Amino acid sequence: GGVVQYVDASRIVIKVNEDEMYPGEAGIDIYNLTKYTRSNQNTCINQM
Amino acid sequence: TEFLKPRLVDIEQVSSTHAKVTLEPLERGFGHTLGNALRRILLSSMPGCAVTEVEIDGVLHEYSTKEGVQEDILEILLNLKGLAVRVQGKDEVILTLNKSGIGPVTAADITHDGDVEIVKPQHVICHLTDENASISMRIKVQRGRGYVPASTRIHSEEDERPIGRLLVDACYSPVERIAYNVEAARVEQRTDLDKLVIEMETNGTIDPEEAIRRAATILAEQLEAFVDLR
């Protein structure tokens, strides 16, 4: 859990709450989204 | 002979996109005929303006993203496809847009033009989510009628296009819904008359009276061939 610090069409950064952090980490989670990738059936895979 | 010809009487204006018109003098049976003909013509052949081309700085194709923009290029093009623009005096104009900072990018941010009016300034185009984010677009608006897919405009071409010019499907018609009703008239001399009420739903950019008169002109121009000797 936390608060959305940065949001983009291909990237999301979450600022983790201090109650869920570890003692020696910056406490940020980065999610990179797959955009317009080929599937096994030659279809489109896209995350928004 | 005893044919009481119709005349435009009243034009209520419910909203910016909703209006009603009335034609009071009608003989028995003419109301439905004219209503159906006018509905078909209004739904089929009205002219309008639509976006046909978009160019964005640092974008090569529609299957891509832009840093600091929450929407994909495809979603931005779809949003631009629903932009209502009224153009007077010319059949082709190029608009420009520039914006910076964090916030939505609405139709009000388009650079002002002398002979171009934006009917709905609150139409959201895209959102910016970074303080250093910026966007710049060159939007081309044309005039036409019907529905012209871009995959058909690519066929009708003899000169190549540079990389970065994004084509958009054009929906020229400004009319969505048409509904008509026939009700009895209030002429005391003849209690066998009826009036035709036509309800229109548009996106602006068109005047109801002008649309009705254009439909009538098209119908008469079509009937000119039947009227003649052959």
mmCIF file of C-alpha atoms in Angstrom:
data_model
loop_
_atom_site.group_PDB
_atom_site.id
_atom_site.type_symbol
_atom_site.label_atom_id
_atom_site.label_comp_id
_atom_site.label_asym_id
_atom_site.label_seq_id
_atom_site.Cartn_x
_atom_site.Cartn_y
_atom_site.Cartn_z
ATOM 1 C CA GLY A 1 0.000 0.000 0.000
ATOM 2 C CA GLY A 2 0.878 3.651 -0.344
ATOM 3 C CA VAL A 3 0.270 6.726 -2.487
ATOM 4 C CA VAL A 4 0.752 7.096 -6.244
ATOM 5 C CA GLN A 5 3.819 9.337 -6.556
ATOM 6 C CA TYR A 6 4.242 9.188 -10.347
ATOM 7 C CA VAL A 7 1.868 7.954 -13.051
ATOM 8 C CA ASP A 8 2.438 7.717 -16.796
ATOM 9 C CA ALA A 9 1.182 5.857 -19.855
ATOM 10 C CA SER A 10 3.963 3.280 -19.358
ATOM 11 C CA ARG A 11 5.197 3.708 -15.766
ATOM 12 C CA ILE A 12 3.735 3.874 -12.249
ATOM 13 C CA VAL A 13 5.687 4.721 -9.080
ATOM 14 C CA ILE A 14 4.198 4.001 -5.642
ATOM 15 C CA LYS A 15 5.442 5.611 -2.421
ATOM 16 C CA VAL A 16 5.190 2.818 0.149
ATOM 17 C CA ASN A 17 3.732 3.550 3.579
ATOM 18 C CA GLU A 18 6.257 3.570 6.412
ATOM 19 C CA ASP A 19 4.352 0.833 8.271
ATOM 20 C CA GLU A 20 5.134 -1.570 5.395
ATOM 21 C CA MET A 21 8.733 -0.483 4.726
ATOM 22 C CA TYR A 22 11.988 -2.274 5.573
ATOM 23 C CA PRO A 23 14.629 -0.582 7.756
ATOM 24 C CA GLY A 24 17.193 0.015 5.011
ATOM 25 C CA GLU A 25 15.213 0.709 1.833
ATOM 26 C CA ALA A 26 13.939 3.801 0.044
ATOM 27 C CA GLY A 27 10.420 2.337 0.077
ATOM 28 C CA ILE A 28 9.334 2.982 -3.517
ATOM 29 C CA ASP A 29 7.792 0.454 -5.912
ATOM 30 C CA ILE A 30 8.190 0.834 -9.682
ATOM 31 C CA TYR A 31 5.858 -0.868 -12.168
ATOM 32 C CA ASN A 32 6.839 -0.930 -15.846
ATOM 33 C CA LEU A 33 3.923 -1.712 -18.160
ATOM 34 C CA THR A 34 4.129 -3.785 -21.331
ATOM 35 C CA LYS A 35 3.016 -1.759 -24.357
ATOM 36 C CA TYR A 36 1.951 -3.131 -27.754
ATOM 37 C CA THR A 37 3.696 -6.504 -27.577
ATOM 38 C CA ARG A 38 2.975 -9.528 -29.753
ATOM 39 C CA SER A 39 1.114 -12.517 -28.325
ATOM 40 C CA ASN A 40 1.299 -16.185 -29.302
ATOM 41 C CA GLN A 41 -1.777 -15.675 -31.519
ATOM 42 C CA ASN A 42 -0.406 -12.520 -33.222
ATOM 43 C CA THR A 43 -2.655 -10.250 -31.146
ATOM 44 C CA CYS A 44 -1.869 -7.102 -29.163
ATOM 45 C CA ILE A 45 -0.936 -7.039 -25.470
ATOM 46 C CA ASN A 46 -1.181 -3.595 -23.883
ATOM 47 C CA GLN A 47 -1.491 -2.265 -20.336
ATOM 48 C CA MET A 48 -3.052 1.058 -19.341
ATOM 49 C CA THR B 1 -56.078 22.850 -55.926
ATOM 50 C CA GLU B 2 -56.998 23.220 -52.231
ATOM 51 C CA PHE B 3 -53.375 22.351 -51.356
ATOM 52 C CA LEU B 4 -52.418 24.373 -48.275
ATOM 53 C CA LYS B 5 -48.635 24.588 -48.616
ATOM 54 C CA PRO B 6 -46.406 24.165 -45.539
ATOM 55 C CA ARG B 7 -44.619 27.087 -43.913
ATOM 56 C CA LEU B 8 -41.998 27.195 -41.172
ATOM 57 C CA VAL B 9 -43.723 28.543 -38.052
ATOM 58 C CA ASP B 10 -41.841 28.051 -34.767
ATOM 59 C CA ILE B 11 -38.299 27.024 -33.810
ATOM 60 C CA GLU B 12 -37.847 26.250 -30.130
ATOM 61 C CA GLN B 13 -34.244 25.976 -28.944
ATOM 62 C CA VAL B 14 -34.119 23.558 -26.006
ATOM 63 C CA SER B 15 -30.327 23.568 -25.590
ATOM 64 C CA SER B 16 -27.202 24.292 -27.615
ATOM 65 C CA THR B 17 -27.619 20.892 -29.313
ATOM 66 C CA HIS B 18 -31.391 20.259 -29.103
ATOM 67 C CA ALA B 19 -34.063 22.073 -31.114
ATOM 68 C CA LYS B 20 -37.558 21.662 -32.561
ATOM 69 C CA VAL B 21 -39.161 22.975 -35.760
ATOM 70 C CA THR B 22 -42.769 23.051 -36.945
ATOM 71 C CA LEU B 23 -44.518 23.166 -40.332
ATOM 72 C CA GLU B 24 -48.183 23.954 -39.726
ATOM 73 C CA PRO B 25 -50.119 23.751 -43.059
ATOM 74 C CA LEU B 26 -50.241 20.160 -44.293
ATOM 75 C CA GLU B 27 -52.848 18.232 -46.251
ATOM 76 C CA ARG B 28 -53.920 14.715 -45.304
ATOM 77 C CA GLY B 29 -51.068 12.235 -45.708
ATOM 78 C CA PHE B 30 -48.303 14.700 -46.604
ATOM 79 C CA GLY B 31 -46.978 14.952 -43.050
ATOM 80 C CA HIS B 32 -45.601 11.414 -42.882
ATOM 81 C CA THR B 33 -44.125 11.602 -46.392
ATOM 82 C CA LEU B 34 -42.243 14.848 -45.780
ATOM 83 C CA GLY B 35 -41.225 13.712 -42.295
ATOM 84 C CA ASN B 36 -39.691 10.473 -43.556
ATOM 85 C CA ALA B 37 -37.976 12.142 -46.523
ATOM 86 C CA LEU B 38 -36.553 14.930 -44.354
ATOM 87 C CA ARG B 39 -35.411 12.471 -41.677
ATOM 88 C CA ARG B 40 -33.550 10.348 -44.226
ATOM 89 C CA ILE B 41 -31.976 13.350 -45.964
ATOM 90 C CA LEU B 42 -30.979 15.043 -42.690
ATOM 91 C CA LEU B 43 -29.432 11.835 -41.353
ATOM 92 C CA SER B 44 -27.652 11.080 -44.642
ATOM 93 C CA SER B 45 -26.411 14.268 -46.319
ATOM 94 C CA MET B 46 -25.636 17.063 -43.955
ATOM 95 C CA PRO B 47 -22.223 18.755 -44.281
ATOM 96 C CA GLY B 48 -19.808 19.423 -41.458
ATOM 97 C CA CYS B 49 -16.200 19.805 -40.368
ATOM 98 C CA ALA B 50 -13.971 17.123 -38.857
ATOM 99 C CA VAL B 51 -10.340 16.522 -37.918
ATOM 100 C CA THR B 52 -8.382 14.627 -40.578
ATOM 101 C CA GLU B 53 -4.677 14.934 -39.674
ATOM 102 C CA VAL B 54 -2.643 15.355 -36.481
ATOM 103 C CA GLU B 55 1.082 16.004 -36.027
ATOM 104 C CA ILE B 56 2.693 15.797 -32.580
ATOM 105 C CA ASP B 57 6.280 16.758 -31.785
ATOM 106 C CA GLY B 58 8.524 13.770 -31.103
ATOM 107 C CA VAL B 59 5.949 11.155 -32.148
ATOM 108 C CA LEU B 60 6.520 8.762 -35.050
ATOM 109 C CA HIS B 61 3.424 6.532 -34.956
ATOM 110 C CA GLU B 62 0.170 6.067 -33.064
ATOM 111 C CA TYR B 63 1.326 2.861 -31.315
ATOM 112 C CA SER B 64 3.569 4.733 -28.892
ATOM 113 C CA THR B 65 3.561 6.723 -25.658
ATOM 114 C CA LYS B 66 4.817 10.139 -24.577
ATOM 115 C CA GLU B 67 6.665 10.919 -21.353
ATOM 116 C CA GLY B 68 4.521 12.889 -18.919
ATOM 117 C CA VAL B 69 1.256 12.102 -20.751
ATOM 118 C CA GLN B 70 -1.215 9.730 -19.108
ATOM 119 C CA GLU B 71 -2.885 8.675 -22.380
ATOM 120 C CA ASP B 72 -1.606 6.734 -25.366
ATOM 121 C CA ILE B 73 -1.456 8.357 -28.795
ATOM 122 C CA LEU B 74 -4.383 6.199 -29.939
ATOM 123 C CA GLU B 75 -6.578 7.489 -27.105
ATOM 124 C CA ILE B 76 -5.533 11.071 -27.898
ATOM 125 C CA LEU B 77 -6.500 10.558 -31.548
ATOM 126 C CA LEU B 78 -9.848 9.079 -30.493
ATOM 127 C CA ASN B 79 -10.461 12.095 -28.246
ATOM 128 C CA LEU B 80 -9.583 14.471 -31.093
ATOM 129 C CA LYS B 81 -11.998 12.566 -33.349
ATOM 130 C CA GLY B 82 -14.865 13.924 -31.233
ATOM 131 C CA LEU B 83 -13.884 17.586 -31.542
ATOM 132 C CA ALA B 84 -16.660 19.889 -32.773
ATOM 133 C CA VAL B 85 -15.398 22.817 -34.863
ATOM 134 C CA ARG B 86 -17.297 25.451 -36.858
ATOM 135 C CA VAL B 87 -15.383 27.000 -39.772
ATOM 136 C CA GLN B 88 -16.582 30.012 -41.774
ATOM 137 C CA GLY B 89 -15.038 31.258 -45.010
ATOM 138 C CA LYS B 90 -12.746 28.351 -45.919
ATOM 139 C CA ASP B 91 -12.778 24.581 -46.393
ATOM 140 C CA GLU B 92 -9.419 23.845 -44.727
ATOM 141 C CA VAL B 93 -7.660 25.241 -41.652
ATOM 142 C CA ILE B 94 -4.738 24.190 -39.444
ATOM 143 C CA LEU B 95 -4.961 24.665 -35.674
ATOM 144 C CA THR B 96 -2.138 24.673 -33.130
ATOM 145 C CA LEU B 97 -2.025 23.690 -29.464
ATOM 146 C CA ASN B 98 0.624 24.269 -26.798
ATOM 147 C CA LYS B 99 0.395 23.510 -23.088
ATOM 148 C CA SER B 100 2.670 22.930 -20.103
ATOM 149 C CA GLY B 101 2.352 22.073 -16.426
ATOM 150 C CA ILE B 102 0.260 19.540 -14.541
ATOM 151 C CA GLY B 103 -3.399 19.413 -15.524
ATOM 152 C CA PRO B 104 -5.921 18.478 -18.203
ATOM 153 C CA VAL B 105 -5.601 19.715 -21.778
ATOM 154 C CA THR B 106 -9.023 20.882 -22.968
ATOM 155 C CA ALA B 107 -10.257 22.389 -26.226
ATOM 156 C CA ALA B 108 -9.902 25.882 -24.721
ATOM 157 C CA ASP B 109 -6.104 25.564 -24.992
ATOM 158 C CA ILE B 110 -6.239 25.622 -28.808
ATOM 159 C CA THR B 111 -4.731 28.835 -30.164
ATOM 160 C CA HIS B 112 -7.416 31.381 -31.011
ATOM 161 C CA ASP B 113 -8.289 31.867 -34.679
ATOM 162 C CA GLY B 114 -10.245 34.658 -36.321
ATOM 163 C CA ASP B 115 -12.667 32.519 -38.341
ATOM 164 C CA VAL B 116 -12.708 29.300 -36.275
ATOM 165 C CA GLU B 117 -15.042 28.708 -33.324
ATOM 166 C CA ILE B 118 -14.824 25.910 -30.752
ATOM 167 C CA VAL B 119 -18.359 24.947 -29.738
ATOM 168 C CA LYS B 120 -17.448 22.949 -26.610
ATOM 169 C CA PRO B 121 -14.371 24.341 -24.802
ATOM 170 C CA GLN B 122 -14.540 21.691 -22.047
ATOM 171 C CA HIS B 123 -13.780 18.754 -24.377
ATOM 172 C CA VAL B 124 -10.862 16.999 -22.673
ATOM 173 C CA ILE B 125 -8.066 15.953 -25.038
ATOM 174 C CA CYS B 126 -5.323 14.594 -22.760
ATOM 175 C CA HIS B 127 -3.805 14.928 -19.289
ATOM 176 C CA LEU B 128 -0.315 15.980 -18.210
ATOM 177 C CA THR B 129 1.156 14.453 -15.050
ATOM 178 C CA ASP B 130 4.679 15.929 -14.887
ATOM 179 C CA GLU B 131 5.798 19.460 -14.074
ATOM 180 C CA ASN B 132 8.281 19.434 -16.978
ATOM 181 C CA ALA B 133 5.816 17.856 -19.422
ATOM 182 C CA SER B 134 4.841 19.762 -22.558
ATOM 183 C CA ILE B 135 2.889 19.046 -25.736
ATOM 184 C CA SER B 136 2.573 20.666 -29.159
ATOM 185 C CA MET B 137 0.150 19.675 -31.916
ATOM 186 C CA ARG B 138 -0.796 20.795 -35.422
ATOM 187 C CA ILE B 139 -4.404 19.796 -36.132
ATOM 188 C CA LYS B 140 -5.836 19.908 -39.659
ATOM 189 C CA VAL B 141 -9.592 20.440 -40.060
ATOM 190 C CA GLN B 142 -11.434 19.925 -43.358
ATOM 191 C CA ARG B 143 -15.041 20.105 -44.556
ATOM 192 C CA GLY B 144 -17.071 17.330 -46.116
ATOM 193 C CA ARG B 145 -20.036 15.006 -45.809
ATOM 194 C CA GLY B 146 -20.494 11.341 -44.971
ATOM 195 C CA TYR B 147 -17.916 8.993 -43.439
ATOM 196 C CA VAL B 148 -14.481 8.745 -45.061
ATOM 197 C CA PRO B 149 -12.147 6.142 -43.526
ATOM 198 C CA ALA B 150 -8.450 6.979 -43.538
ATOM 199 C CA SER B 151 -7.719 3.568 -45.070
ATOM 200 C CA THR B 152 -9.639 4.875 -48.093
ATOM 201 C CA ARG B 153 -7.902 8.268 -48.159
ATOM 202 C CA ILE B 154 -4.530 6.506 -48.327
ATOM 203 C CA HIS B 155 -5.709 4.865 -51.566
ATOM 204 C CA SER B 156 -6.662 8.203 -53.173
ATOM 205 C CA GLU B 157 -3.176 9.693 -53.076
ATOM 206 C CA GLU B 158 -0.261 10.219 -55.456
ATOM 207 C CA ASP B 159 2.374 11.864 -53.213
ATOM 208 C CA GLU B 160 4.082 10.293 -50.216
ATOM 209 C CA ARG B 161 3.599 11.472 -46.629
ATOM 210 C CA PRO B 162 6.429 12.156 -44.160
ATOM 211 C CA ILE B 163 6.898 10.022 -41.069
ATOM 212 C CA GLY B 164 5.024 11.537 -38.126
ATOM 213 C CA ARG B 165 1.768 12.642 -39.797
ATOM 214 C CA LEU B 166 -1.107 10.715 -38.210
ATOM 215 C CA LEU B 167 -4.324 10.186 -40.159
ATOM 216 C CA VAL B 168 -7.710 10.211 -38.419
ATOM 217 C CA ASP B 169 -11.036 8.821 -39.605
ATOM 218 C CA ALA B 170 -13.480 11.627 -40.398
ATOM 219 C CA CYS B 171 -17.137 11.706 -39.316
ATOM 220 C CA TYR B 172 -18.397 14.822 -41.085
ATOM 221 C CA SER B 173 -22.107 14.583 -40.234
ATOM 222 C CA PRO B 174 -23.154 16.898 -37.355
ATOM 223 C CA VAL B 175 -26.554 15.230 -36.719
ATOM 224 C CA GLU B 176 -27.013 12.261 -34.370
ATOM 225 C CA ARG B 177 -30.756 11.779 -33.780
ATOM 226 C CA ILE B 178 -33.859 12.829 -35.727
ATOM 227 C CA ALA B 179 -37.436 12.251 -34.547
ATOM 228 C CA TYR B 180 -40.631 13.628 -36.088
ATOM 229 C CA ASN B 181 -44.296 13.576 -35.081
ATOM 230 C CA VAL B 182 -47.594 14.425 -36.784
ATOM 231 C CA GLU B 183 -50.336 16.176 -34.807
ATOM 232 C CA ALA B 184 -53.598 17.866 -35.734
ATOM 233 C CA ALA B 185 -53.491 21.546 -36.671
ATOM 234 C CA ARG B 186 -55.587 24.307 -35.091
ATOM 235 C CA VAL B 187 -56.955 25.954 -38.252
ATOM 236 C CA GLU B 188 -60.606 26.720 -37.521
ATOM 237 C CA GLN B 189 -61.545 26.916 -41.216
ATOM 238 C CA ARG B 190 -60.270 23.386 -41.960
ATOM 239 C CA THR B 191 -60.319 20.855 -39.112
ATOM 240 C CA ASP B 192 -58.762 18.186 -41.373
ATOM 241 C CA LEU B 193 -55.226 19.629 -41.311
ATOM 242 C CA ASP B 194 -52.147 18.609 -39.344
ATOM 243 C CA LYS B 195 -48.719 19.958 -38.422
ATOM 244 C CA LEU B 196 -45.298 18.301 -38.551
ATOM 245 C CA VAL B 197 -42.895 18.668 -35.615
ATOM 246 C CA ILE B 198 -39.261 17.649 -36.142
ATOM 247 C CA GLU B 199 -36.866 17.109 -33.231
ATOM 248 C CA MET B 200 -33.126 17.439 -33.848
ATOM 249 C CA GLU B 201 -30.029 16.393 -31.904
ATOM 250 C CA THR B 202 -26.730 17.887 -33.050
ATOM 251 C CA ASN B 203 -23.224 18.726 -31.823
ATOM 252 C CA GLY B 204 -23.622 22.405 -32.599
ATOM 253 C CA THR B 205 -21.857 23.734 -35.695
ATOM 254 C CA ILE B 206 -25.192 23.714 -37.563
ATOM 255 C CA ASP B 207 -28.372 25.819 -37.469
ATOM 256 C CA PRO B 208 -31.671 23.872 -37.494
ATOM 257 C CA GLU B 209 -33.381 26.191 -39.987
ATOM 258 C CA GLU B 210 -30.428 26.029 -42.381
ATOM 259 C CA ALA B 211 -30.377 22.229 -42.104
ATOM 260 C CA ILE B 212 -34.101 21.985 -42.885
ATOM 261 C CA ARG B 213 -33.798 24.360 -45.845
ATOM 262 C CA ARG B 214 -30.772 22.469 -47.190
ATOM 263 C CA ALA B 215 -32.667 19.174 -46.923
ATOM 264 C CA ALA B 216 -35.632 20.684 -48.775
ATOM 265 C CA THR B 217 -33.296 22.063 -51.453
ATOM 266 C CA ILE B 218 -31.681 18.640 -51.911
ATOM 267 C CA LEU B 219 -35.088 16.968 -52.207
ATOM 268 C CA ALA B 220 -36.300 19.522 -54.768
ATOM 269 C CA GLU B 221 -33.061 19.223 -56.758
ATOM 270 C CA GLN B 222 -33.581 15.451 -56.830
ATOM 271 C CA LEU B 223 -37.220 15.831 -57.919
ATOM 272 C CA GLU B 224 -36.200 18.159 -60.768
ATOM 273 C CA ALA B 225 -35.311 15.074 -62.825
ATOM 274 C CA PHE B 226 -38.747 13.509 -62.315
ATOM 275 C CA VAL B 227 -40.486 16.814 -63.083
ATOM 276 C CA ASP B 228 -38.946 17.183 -66.552
ATOM 277 C CA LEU B 229 -40.221 15.794 -69.850
ATOM 278 C CA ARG B 230 -38.643 12.342 -69.499
#
